[PDB]
Symmetry: C2
Subunit: 143 residues, 2 copies
């Protein structure tokens, strides 16, 4: 259908075990294009701001701790049906419920340590992308 | 077996052909760790500054034009013997002279569009890394 952009995060687990390349390759093989990317070590404030909607939930602290335990790679992916297609390759949030051959199935150890993040929707994608990237930071493909 | 850092650039050809993941994976498979990375679209000044040592060369204009023709990915790779090790997996600058299985052999179409850059020495690596990255930008692995 229409060209969408979605946020990817390779989480501290997948980075520490050096799966950045393999994961990126999954994106690109499925036809998604990386139009922005950067490695970051999120501060407590960064993670808390990003996951702000879950501020009152029981798992908030766990989530913040895991996402600040080490450097991540934050990326913007562009393509047809990007949000859902990205979601398909990632697999279920729960790696034990994730289908074989997906990123979570292949690289995730647990719920907390589930390798990668992807935006849940187009609406969530715009906010998440805007959280990590200035609009002039997202590089159109020339060439 | 002393740990070094070297600069990697995925050039606009390999980026436009969506080989970022595959190339990254080659790095990680070789025991190198990605400790910094970002996608950038180099300005003419950016490119001219980085390649300043070739300013007087005839091919300078072609080099700058190609390296500004589209987005690149600049990265810092870390590991034992990183400079030389990176150059081994990259292969010869000329893809016709590159060994099988190297990045240039697999992803380069020509000498001009040869997929990727790697620092040629420790002195140049220290300069190239500092050109694109603040020390505070290079993320040590904490897990």
């Amino acid at each position: 259908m229409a060209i969408e952009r979605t946020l990817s995060i390779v989480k501290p687990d997948a980075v520490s075990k050096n799966h950045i390349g393999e994961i990126f390759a999954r994106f690109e093989k499925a036809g998604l294009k990386i139009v922005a990317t950067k490695m970051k070590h999120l501060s407590q404030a960064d993670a808390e701001g990003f996951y702000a909607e879950h501020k009152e939930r029981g798992f908030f602290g766990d989530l913040v701790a895991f996402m600040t335990s080490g450097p991540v790679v934050v990326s913007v992916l562009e393509g047809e049906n990007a949000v859902l297609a990205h979601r398909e390759i990632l697999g279920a949030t729960n790696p034990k419920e994730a289908a074989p051959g997906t990123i979570r199935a292949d690289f995730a150890v647990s719920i907390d340590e589930n390798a990668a993040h992807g935006s849940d929707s187009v609406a969530s994608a715009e906010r998440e992308i805007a959280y990590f990237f200035a609009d002039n930071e997202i590089c159109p493909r020339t060439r």
